[PDB]
């Protein structure tokens, strides 16, 4: 067996997100991101009583933290992973192959704990900043509002 392998793109996954990459890292915790305008207003009134100007740009928020995953190689394991050219010598090469098999389905561990990372992180979202129907199901009209 090989853990099931044909690639990144074979059904339907990339719009939980949009993107921008972010390689260079190492500088932020709860920085900024912006835009610079606001939400529709005033030509139905009387000569209405006054309210006060249009033109603020409300402010917002950021996270950080972690998401962790290991791959534990025993002591018994890295010396018969070292050479000194002591090996080449008919009791290291063949069972060498059988073994090749074992640890290249978990160190590319280094490839199955990222690009399945987010069915237990993002259902984070639809756990955690817009819950159920009790607000907004058939709308269009009962809340421009407030007053």
């Amino acid at each position: 067996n090989t853990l099931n392998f044909v690639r990144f793109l074979e059904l339907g996954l990339s719009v939980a997100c949009i993107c921008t990459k972010f390689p260079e890292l190492a500088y932020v915790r709860d920085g900024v991101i912006q835009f610079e305008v606001q939400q529709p207003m005033i030509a139905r009134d009387g000569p209405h009583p006054v309210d006060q100007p249009v033109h603020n740009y409300m402010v917002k928020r950021i996270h950080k933290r972690s998401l962790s995953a290991a791959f534990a190689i025993a002591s018994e394991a890295l010396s018969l992973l070292s050479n000194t050219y002591v090996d080449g010598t008919e009791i290291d090469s063949s069972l060498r192959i059988r073994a090749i098999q074992q640890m290249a389905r978990n160190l590319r561990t280094v490839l199955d704990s990222f690009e399945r990372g987010t069915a237990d992180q993002l259902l984070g979202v639809l756990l955690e900043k817009a819950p159920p129907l009790s607000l907004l199901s058939p709308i269009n009209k009962f809340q421009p509002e407030g007053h």
Binding site: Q39, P40, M41, I42, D45, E145, G146, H147
Partner: protein, 40 residues
């Protein structure tokens, strides 16, 4: 002339048309007007 479907429904033997104003004006702030509200 300047093409568009803002287009055609039918009522009798005519046509009629139906895609109506909730796609163009004014979201998210704070005062009021004529309209629905209440009646005795």
């Amino acid at each position: 002339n300047a093409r568009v479907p803002a287009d055609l429904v039918i009522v009798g033997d005519k046509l009629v048309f139906l895609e109506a104003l909730e796609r163009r004006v004014y979201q998210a702030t704070r005062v009021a007007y004529p309209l629905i509200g209440n009646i005795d």
